[PDB]
Design an enzyme around this catalytic site. Sequence first.
Site, PDB file in Angstrom:
ATOM      1  CD  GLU A  11     -29.602  18.103  -1.772  1.00  0.00           C
ATOM      2  OE1 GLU A  11     -30.667  18.300  -1.244  1.00  0.00           O
ATOM      3  OE2 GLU A  11     -28.933  19.005  -2.432  1.00  0.00           O
ATOM      4  CE1 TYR A  17      -7.374  -0.780  -6.861  1.00  0.00           C
ATOM      5  CE2 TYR A  17      -8.038  -3.137  -6.926  1.00  0.00           C
ATOM      6  CZ  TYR A  17      -7.251  -2.095  -6.373  1.00  0.00           C
ATOM      7  OH  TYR A  17      -6.370  -2.374  -5.428  1.00  0.00           O
ATOM      8  CB  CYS A  34      -1.043  -0.087   1.129  1.00  0.00           C
ATOM      9  SG  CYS A  34      -2.088   1.332   1.314  1.00  0.00           S
ATOM     10  CG  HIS A  67     -30.141  22.008  -0.894  1.00  0.00           C
ATOM     11  ND1 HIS A  67     -29.929  21.285  -2.035  1.00  0.00           N
ATOM     12  CD2 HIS A  67     -30.665  23.186  -1.294  1.00  0.00           C
ATOM     13  CE1 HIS A  67     -30.360  22.025  -3.059  1.00  0.00           C
ATOM     14  NE2 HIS A  67     -30.743  23.198  -2.677  1.00  0.00           N
ATOM     15  CD  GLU A  84      -7.597   3.035  -8.401  1.00  0.00           C
ATOM     16  OE1 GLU A  84      -8.427   3.245  -7.597  1.00  0.00           O
ATOM     17  OE2 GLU A  84      -6.392   2.692  -8.148  1.00  0.00           O
ATOM     18  CB  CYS A  97      -3.289   2.833  -0.815  1.00  0.00           C
ATOM     19  SG  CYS A  97      -3.368   1.151  -0.161  1.00  0.00           S
ATOM     20  CE  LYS A 142      -5.643   4.535  -5.446  1.00  0.00           C
ATOM     21  NZ  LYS A 142      -5.924   3.094  -5.638  1.00  0.00           N
TER      22      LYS A 142
HETATM   23  C1  LIG Z   1      -1.404  -0.221  -7.552  1.00  0.00           C
HETATM   24  C2  LIG Z   1      -2.214  -0.553  -6.315  1.00  0.00           C
HETATM   25  C3  LIG Z   1      -3.093   0.343  -5.782  1.00  0.00           C
HETATM   26  C4  LIG Z   1      -3.835  -0.021  -4.658  1.00  0.00           C
HETATM   27  N1  LIG Z   1      -4.699   0.894  -4.134  1.00  0.00           N
HETATM   28  C5  LIG Z   1      -5.318   0.538  -3.056  1.00  0.00           C
HETATM   29  C6  LIG Z   1      -6.230   1.526  -2.477  1.00  0.00           C
HETATM   30  O1  LIG Z   1      -6.271   2.633  -2.920  1.00  0.00           O
HETATM   31  N2  LIG Z   1      -6.935   1.169  -1.369  1.00  0.00           N
HETATM   32  C7  LIG Z   1      -6.843  -0.119  -0.827  1.00  0.00           C
HETATM   33  O2  LIG Z   1      -7.539  -0.376   0.085  1.00  0.00           O
HETATM   34  N3  LIG Z   1      -5.994  -1.070  -1.386  1.00  0.00           N
HETATM   35  C8  LIG Z   1      -5.316  -0.733  -2.457  1.00  0.00           C
HETATM   36  N4  LIG Z   1      -4.501  -1.620  -3.001  1.00  0.00           N
HETATM   37  C9  LIG Z   1      -4.422  -2.933  -2.390  1.00  0.00           C
HETATM   38  C10 LIG Z   1      -3.535  -3.019  -1.124  1.00  0.00           C
HETATM   39  O3  LIG Z   1      -2.253  -2.425  -1.424  1.00  0.00           O
HETATM   40  C11 LIG Z   1      -3.344  -4.496  -0.619  1.00  0.00           C
HETATM   41  O4  LIG Z   1      -4.629  -5.069  -0.321  1.00  0.00           O
HETATM   42  C12 LIG Z   1      -2.570  -4.563   0.720  1.00  0.00           C
HETATM   43  O5  LIG Z   1      -1.268  -3.980   0.596  1.00  0.00           O
HETATM   44  C13 LIG Z   1      -2.468  -6.007   1.248  1.00  0.00           C
HETATM   45  O6  LIG Z   1      -1.698  -6.037   2.498  1.00  0.00           O
HETATM   46  P1  LIG Z   1      -1.003  -7.324   3.084  1.00  0.00           P
HETATM   47  O7  LIG Z   1      -0.924  -6.969   4.483  1.00  0.00           O
HETATM   48  O8  LIG Z   1      -1.620  -8.627   2.702  1.00  0.00           O
HETATM   49  O9  LIG Z   1       0.455  -7.339   2.331  1.00  0.00           O
HETATM   50  P2  LIG Z   1       1.450  -6.289   1.722  1.00  0.00           P
HETATM   51  O10 LIG Z   1       0.991  -4.951   2.024  1.00  0.00           O
HETATM   52  O11 LIG Z   1       1.858  -6.634   0.323  1.00  0.00           O
HETATM   53  O12 LIG Z   1       2.720  -6.595   2.592  1.00  0.00           O
HETATM   54  C14 LIG Z   1       3.358  -7.894   2.513  1.00  0.00           C
HETATM   55  C15 LIG Z   1       4.797  -7.657   2.949  1.00  0.00           C
HETATM   56  O13 LIG Z   1       5.479  -8.959   3.134  1.00  0.00           O
HETATM   57  C16 LIG Z   1       6.890  -8.710   2.783  1.00  0.00           C
HETATM   58  N5  LIG Z   1       7.301 -10.116   2.568  1.00  0.00           N
HETATM   59  C17 LIG Z   1       6.733 -11.003   1.654  1.00  0.00           C
HETATM   60  N6  LIG Z   1       7.225 -12.228   1.760  1.00  0.00           N
HETATM   61  C18 LIG Z   1       8.096 -12.200   2.812  1.00  0.00           C
HETATM   62  C19 LIG Z   1       8.940 -13.254   3.420  1.00  0.00           C
HETATM   63  N7  LIG Z   1       9.011 -14.482   3.038  1.00  0.00           N
HETATM   64  N8  LIG Z   1       9.708 -12.815   4.437  1.00  0.00           N
HETATM   65  C20 LIG Z   1       9.664 -11.492   4.856  1.00  0.00           C
HETATM   66  N9  LIG Z   1       8.927 -10.470   4.379  1.00  0.00           N
HETATM   67  C21 LIG Z   1       8.164 -10.871   3.357  1.00  0.00           C
HETATM   68  C22 LIG Z   1       6.731  -7.882   1.564  1.00  0.00           C
HETATM   69  O14 LIG Z   1       7.927  -7.234   1.357  1.00  0.00           O
HETATM   70  C23 LIG Z   1       5.717  -6.838   2.036  1.00  0.00           C
HETATM   71  O15 LIG Z   1       6.193  -5.687   2.620  1.00  0.00           O
HETATM   72  C24 LIG Z   1      -3.730  -1.289  -4.092  1.00  0.00           C
HETATM   73  C25 LIG Z   1      -2.805  -2.204  -4.589  1.00  0.00           C
HETATM   74  C26 LIG Z   1      -2.043  -1.839  -5.678  1.00  0.00           C
HETATM   75  C27 LIG Z   1      -1.093  -2.866  -6.214  1.00  0.00           C
HETATM   76  C1  LIG Z   2     -27.224  33.689   1.377  1.00  0.00           C
HETATM   77  C2  LIG Z   2     -27.942  32.422   1.794  1.00  0.00           C
HETATM   78  C3  LIG Z   2     -27.380  31.194   1.605  1.00  0.00           C
HETATM   79  C4  LIG Z   2     -28.071  30.059   2.030  1.00  0.00           C
HETATM   80  N1  LIG Z   2     -27.496  28.840   1.820  1.00  0.00           N
HETATM   81  C5  LIG Z   2     -28.199  27.814   2.172  1.00  0.00           C
HETATM   82  C6  LIG Z   2     -27.596  26.502   1.928  1.00  0.00           C
HETATM   83  O1  LIG Z   2     -26.578  26.418   1.313  1.00  0.00           O
HETATM   84  N2  LIG Z   2     -28.287  25.400   2.329  1.00  0.00           N
HETATM   85  C7  LIG Z   2     -29.507  25.507   3.007  1.00  0.00           C
HETATM   86  O2  LIG Z   2     -30.006  24.514   3.390  1.00  0.00           O
HETATM   87  N3  LIG Z   2     -30.074  26.752   3.263  1.00  0.00           N
HETATM   88  C8  LIG Z   2     -29.412  27.818   2.883  1.00  0.00           C
HETATM   89  N4  LIG Z   2     -29.935  29.010   3.112  1.00  0.00           N
HETATM   90  C9  LIG Z   2     -31.213  29.070   3.797  1.00  0.00           C
HETATM   91  C10 LIG Z   2     -32.450  28.789   2.911  1.00  0.00           C
HETATM   92  O3  LIG Z   2     -32.367  29.622   1.735  1.00  0.00           O
HETATM   93  C11 LIG Z   2     -33.805  29.047   3.666  1.00  0.00           C
HETATM   94  O4  LIG Z   2     -33.871  28.206   4.830  1.00  0.00           O
HETATM   95  C12 LIG Z   2     -35.036  28.637   2.820  1.00  0.00           C
HETATM   96  O5  LIG Z   2     -35.085  29.365   1.588  1.00  0.00           O
HETATM   97  C13 LIG Z   2     -36.350  28.812   3.605  1.00  0.00           C
HETATM   98  O6  LIG Z   2     -37.497  28.449   2.761  1.00  0.00           O
HETATM   99  P1  LIG Z   2     -38.979  28.912   3.027  1.00  0.00           P
HETATM  100  O7  LIG Z   2     -39.709  27.875   2.334  1.00  0.00           O
HETATM  101  O8  LIG Z   2     -39.321  29.211   4.448  1.00  0.00           O
HETATM  102  O9  LIG Z   2     -39.054  30.373   2.284  1.00  0.00           O
HETATM  103  P2  LIG Z   2     -38.364  31.087   1.069  1.00  0.00           P
HETATM  104  O10 LIG Z   2     -37.528  30.142   0.360  1.00  0.00           O
HETATM  105  O11 LIG Z   2     -37.815  32.432   1.434  1.00  0.00           O
HETATM  106  O12 LIG Z   2     -39.628  31.399   0.194  1.00  0.00           O
HETATM  107  C14 LIG Z   2     -40.656  32.290   0.695  1.00  0.00           C
HETATM  108  C15 LIG Z   2     -41.351  32.831  -0.547  1.00  0.00           C
HETATM  109  O13 LIG Z   2     -42.572  33.569  -0.149  1.00  0.00           O
HETATM  110  C16 LIG Z   2     -42.727  34.634  -1.157  1.00  0.00           C
HETATM  111  N5  LIG Z   2     -43.645  35.511  -0.394  1.00  0.00           N
HETATM  112  C17 LIG Z   2     -43.387  36.073   0.856  1.00  0.00           C
HETATM  113  N6  LIG Z   2     -44.433  36.717   1.350  1.00  0.00           N
HETATM  114  C18 LIG Z   2     -45.450  36.537   0.456  1.00  0.00           C
HETATM  115  C19 LIG Z   2     -46.855  37.004   0.455  1.00  0.00           C
HETATM  116  N7  LIG Z   2     -47.417  37.719   1.368  1.00  0.00           N
HETATM  117  N8  LIG Z   2     -47.546  36.646  -0.646  1.00  0.00           N
HETATM  118  C20 LIG Z   2     -46.958  35.891  -1.653  1.00  0.00           C
HETATM  119  N9  LIG Z   2     -45.701  35.413  -1.738  1.00  0.00           N
HETATM  120  C21 LIG Z   2     -44.986  35.765  -0.665  1.00  0.00           C
HETATM  121  C22 LIG Z   2     -41.327  35.105  -1.280  1.00  0.00           C
HETATM  122  O14 LIG Z   2     -41.237  35.802  -2.464  1.00  0.00           O
HETATM  123  C23 LIG Z   2     -40.577  33.784  -1.466  1.00  0.00           C
HETATM  124  O15 LIG Z   2     -40.411  33.305  -2.744  1.00  0.00           O
HETATM  125  C24 LIG Z   2     -29.299  30.151   2.680  1.00  0.00           C
HETATM  126  C25 LIG Z   2     -29.914  31.391   2.842  1.00  0.00           C
HETATM  127  C26 LIG Z   2     -29.254  32.513   2.392  1.00  0.00           C
HETATM  128  C27 LIG Z   2     -29.926  33.832   2.626  1.00  0.00           C
END
Ligand SMILES: Cc1cc2nc3c(=O)[nH]c(=O)nc-3n(C[C@H](O)[C@H](O)[C@H](O)COP(=O)(O)OP(=O)(O)OC[C@H]3O[C@@H](n4cnc5c(N)ncnc54)[C@H](O)[C@@H]3O)c2cc1C
Ligand SMILES: Cc1cc2nc3c(=O)[nH]c(=O)nc-3n(C[C@H](O)[C@H](O)[C@H](O)COP(=O)(O)OP(=O)(O)OC[C@H]3O[C@@H](n4cnc5c(N)ncnc54)[C@H](O)[C@@H]3O)c2cc1C
Lengths: 461, 461
Positions: free
Chosen positions: A455, A180, A41, A450, A184, A46, A49
Amino acid sequence: VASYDYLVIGGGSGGLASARRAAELGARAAVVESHKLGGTCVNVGCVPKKVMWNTAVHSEFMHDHADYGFPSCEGKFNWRVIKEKRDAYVSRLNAIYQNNLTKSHIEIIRGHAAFTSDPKPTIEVSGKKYTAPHILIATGGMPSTPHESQIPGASLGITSDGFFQLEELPGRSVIVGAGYIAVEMAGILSALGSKTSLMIRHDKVLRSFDSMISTNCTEELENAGVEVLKFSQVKEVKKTLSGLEVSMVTAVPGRLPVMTMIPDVDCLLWAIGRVPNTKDLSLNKLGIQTDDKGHIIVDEFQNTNVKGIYAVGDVCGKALLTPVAIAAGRKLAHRLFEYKEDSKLDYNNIPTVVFSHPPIGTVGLTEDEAIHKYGIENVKTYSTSFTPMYHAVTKRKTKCVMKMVCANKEEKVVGIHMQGLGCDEMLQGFAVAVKMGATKADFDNTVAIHPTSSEELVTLR
Amino acid sequence: VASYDYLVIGGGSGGLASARRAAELGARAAVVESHKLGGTCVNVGCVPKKVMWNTAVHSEFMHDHADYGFPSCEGKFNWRVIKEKRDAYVSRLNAIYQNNLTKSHIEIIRGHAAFTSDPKPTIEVSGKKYTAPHILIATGGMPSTPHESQIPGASLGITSDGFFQLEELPGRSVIVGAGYIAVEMAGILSALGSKTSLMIRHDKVLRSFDSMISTNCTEELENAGVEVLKFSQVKEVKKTLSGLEVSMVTAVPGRLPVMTMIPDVDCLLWAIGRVPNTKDLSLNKLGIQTDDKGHIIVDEFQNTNVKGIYAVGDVCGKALLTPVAIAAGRKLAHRLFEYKEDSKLDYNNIPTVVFSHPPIGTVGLTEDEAIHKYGIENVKTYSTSFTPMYHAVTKRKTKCVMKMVCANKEEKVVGIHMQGLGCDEMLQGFAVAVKMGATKADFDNTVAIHPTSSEELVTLR
Ligand SMILES: Cc1cc2nc3c(=O)[nH]c(=O)nc-3n(C[C@H](O)[C@H](O)[C@H](O)COP(=O)(O)OP(=O)(O)OC[C@H]3O[C@@H](n4cnc5c(N)ncnc54)[C@H](O)[C@@H]3O)c2cc1C
Ligand SMILES: Cc1cc2nc3c(=O)[nH]c(=O)nc-3n(C[C@H](O)[C@H](O)[C@H](O)COP(=O)(O)OP(=O)(O)OC[C@H]3O[C@@H](n4cnc5c(N)ncnc54)[C@H](O)[C@@H]3O)c2cc1C
Ligand SMILES: N[C@@H](CCNC(=O)[C@@H](CSSC[C@@H](NC(=O)CC(=O)O)C(=O)NCC[C@H](N)C(=O)O)NC(=O)CC(=O)O)C(=O)O
Ligand SMILES: N[C@@H](CCNC(=O)[C@@H](CSSC[C@@H](NC(=O)CC(=O)O)C(=O)NCC[C@H](N)C(=O)O)NC(=O)CC(=O)O)C(=O)O
């Protein structure tokens, strides 16, 4: 014969995690490691990579620069810059790991271990013998390469290992595999500017993923500039005056086979599978069972067929991920040193992220698998497809696809599949929810965040 | 007097969601809207905000360009470009919403509604009368501004509304407020290059968030180039030859007050609070109860004190978020038109994301609140702080802080707080887990996704 409470063969993900936890429990443990700590790894997996992926990600975001109000960014990626930095980062981790061992009082035996002929299970490393009543084999795997006998010149191509040694960005690259790693790698080479082809034996990649993901993933590859050669396979490789020339057979079903030469290839990368590293252990001196690929066979508790010999991670050939080796090595330390006999890893519901563009997150059953487990009449799915708000103002587009597989009347969530911006970080908590047995009402009763992509999973209808 | 099954006053988040669901249930509904559909979120809130944040995000990532192998990106952000595009996008949503109403057979009554003197609850819009046995007030809120009587020249500054009307990037900007809007706006103006100050009455922003978040958030602001003026407040504003001049009093406790002039201010932005839009409804003709801020008072089912008059969302002044208006308007349609008497929104465990740099995600109780609910002896927290792997190779850095609050022996998770890259998309599923009542064992028994930021929440110790 030095004796320990626990001897761990392999200093990678699983071996390290196991040794460390065992030591907290009071065990006197030693880690045997013949290469660098951190194992696959950290060194060639891992870590290097993800660094390269974050690099590719910068390449794509930079295509959107002008759309966002900024002035066009012009150019050439410099591979050596990032490569040096990536290497240093890996060096930094190796020393941390080493220090982790040290602070834990774990002994590090440097060298290559092999079992002996001796009756009580014992290993030898560099002429010295070591023994323990609990021995962990965690030697992981390696990249599989073709035999020159089946594909002449196979040896002119490199593996994922070799990819981490490259010093320049290859001008033309051909990747063979549909897993994979293949995916990759094609995605990183492409984004960075390599003229890239992905050679797959069928029509889609990730064929073991839910079919919504293999389809969407094959498309996104194409849309991102990767040439997927379907139904193709390599017949031969040769070293030409300027690079390599790849001979391939393309066999679309319902058509005559066609042979093509691919010339001027800088990089041929084999991403065809992984083989277990068990070959040089002398297992047979203890009669430890392996399968015909050289995998060590274990039971649900990680036991081998021999008492006080266990195996975790890649070597066992199931769920080839770092966190699975870790979780299994950890549960095993609790079982052995804390006497928790029921301590074992549940292999269901393990989540995976594939670092593609956009990334892929998956946990649990595919639609097909739920269909086979519960029956068509008991499986209902929900899905959505949309363009993330990030692209509202860009000319370049990507899509987000989500799928939720439910079972029975209760609509228990047995599977979540998605692909899209943000999907690498979105996965973890749904994976918690899925582990707890949530149903769709549970998701539905969670107030949405959101505006996000995440979501959408809680507002499926 | 035209009669309906449901009359909805307000065409924003809550009113639209309510009207739509009600219509699926068979109700004959009308939406009264005096401005643009979509209400605050779409027009001047969530949407135009997120677009501007994704824009700021590009500005920061572009600072990392050179570190990643690429050549330095040089320049000037063009505000009008993105503003035109943002506006168009909002126009696009308005027409979709309108069409949603249409397909649902919802009638849209355009104009400003007010209750009448009439005995059975009835409104008037443009001389015509309308009535229904169920009337929903969902007229939301507006930006609060200071009275010229308390702060002379207050009227020379703008609000978040005005921010969405700006045509150029202000050279110098001063934001007053310490809430999320304030924070978000300071972060967008800053990243885009405005020389920005955030004027807060205490020493930290987001003072109602867990204290790990208000502290970390105040620091990240400073590190990103925002000048936070603590213990300061505006005393007066004046129009000078070239911009505005802000007179402020700074009152650090244990020190003498000091008065300062802030000159050459292009933009003064009030982000001090929101007021309910109830003023022009003629509520008092029905005796509908409000609080002293003009908020409509409701019960757990969204009832007002008057039969067949309900209120949801911002107007009610609790949990001022779009998904809360939506969830409440939806639960209310089920209760009224599907006879589910127990149908109501649970106001606990609502999650929030603050679009800062890095973004903030929070769900459930702060450490203090759990302490007050369960007692110090029954609250245990876990936390972590680390530098995301994205920064392993950059000179610029940000941090990731996570905190998990547990209660009782079981270590039920009652609160999750974090700040960091990716935290906007990571929140949703943990929020599902928290809603289901998960404990820390549940999190711990979930296999980690590696390498991510999100795996830290499942490996806390
Ligand atoms: C290109 C690539 C990308 C990967 N990417 C990921 C990833 O992103 N996420 C993930 O979860 N897994 C990934 N894997 C898989 C992961 O690397 C293996 O599942 C993991 O290393 C297995 O661990 P292990 O403990 O069985 O042995 P290893 O990690 O291979 O270790 C075995 C060790 O035994 C030593 N050894 C062997 N024989 C002897 C002996 N007779 N005497 C003494 N020492 C010895 C070796 O030198 C080595 O260090 C990837 C694998 C590869 C090849
Ligand atoms: C800058 C900013 C960023 C935000 N970012 C997020 C975020 O990323 N994620 C998140 O979950 N929340 C976020 N929020 C919060 C989210 O926008 C509010 O919780 C949400 O819009 C509330 O919905 P509501 O249904 O109560 O009313 P609103 O969405 O305000 O709608 C009320 C509506 O009633 C209309 N209206 C009002 N009075 C009357 C009336 N008398 N007659 C007719 N129509 C009327 C208005 O025009 C409006 O369209 C953010 C808010 C702001 C200000
Ligand atoms: N939440 C996503 C985008 C969500 N929506 C879309 O891309 C809309 C394009 S507009 S539909 C309104 C889109 N939102 C807004 O701008 C809304 C807002 O301001 O609330 C939306 O569907 N938002 C999410 C509402 C939620 N999914 C729910 O059911 O509560 N199309 C689809 O969902 C595909 C379809 O079902 O036709 C994001 O922020 O990127
Ligand atoms: N998962 C995060 C970063 C995680 N780790 C760190 O930033 C390490 C710097 S190195 S520690 C190993 C870091 N990982 C790797 O590179 C490991 C890998 O290849 O597995 C790590 O801690 N990984 C996560 C392991 C997990 N959190 C567990 O307990 O199973 N420092 C801390 O966690 C703070 C501390 O407790 O001192 C990411 O991918 O950004």
